[PDB]
Amino acid sequence: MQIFVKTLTGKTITLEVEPSDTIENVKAKIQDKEGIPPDQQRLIFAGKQLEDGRTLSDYNIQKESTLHLVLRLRGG
Amino acid sequence: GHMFPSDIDPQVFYELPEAVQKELLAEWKRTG
């Protein structure tokens, strides 16, 4: 499937994943598309924030669905 | 203040939840 990660600049990067794909691996595809390391990058969906150990399905996201990408400076 | 790197723009940053914006602007300002 595919999902549309809107970046914070007003961009939308579509990426191809599974509902069972984890947020960590989604952010790693953002690193492929945008260049941002996952530990430094955050993910929102529908005015809520996601965690690396969760999945699109955990947030009930499906195909052709939109996400939000922020920069969060650091993590470790 | 509604951006820091070129990766940020007020429109999406307003669609954004306030508490995550709070993290962002405060940290952006701090590392700034």
The two tokens of residue A48 are 């809520």
For chain A, domains (ranges, CATH) are 1-76 (3.10.20.90)
Residue B22 amino acid letter = K
Q: Which residues of B touch A (CB under 8 A)?
A: 3-9, 11-13, 15-17, 20, 23-24, 27-28, 31
**Domain locations along chain B:** 1-32
Full 3-state SS string of B1-32: CCCCCCCCCHHHHHHCCHHHHHHHHHHHHHHC
The two tokens of residue A34 are 């945008």
What is chain B's alpha carbon radius of gyration, rounded to the nearest angstrom?
9
For residue A25, give the H/E element and its range.
helix A23-33
Residue A12 amino acid letter = T
Alpha-carbon distance A69 to B5, whole Å?
13
The number of beta carbons lying within 10 Å of the beta carbon of residue B13 is 20
Residues of A in contact with B23 (CB under 8 A): 42, 72
Beta carbons of B15 and A68 less than 8 angstroms apart: yes
Residue B16 amino acid letter = L
Alpha-carbon distance A11 to B17, whole Å?
18
Deposited experimental method: NMR
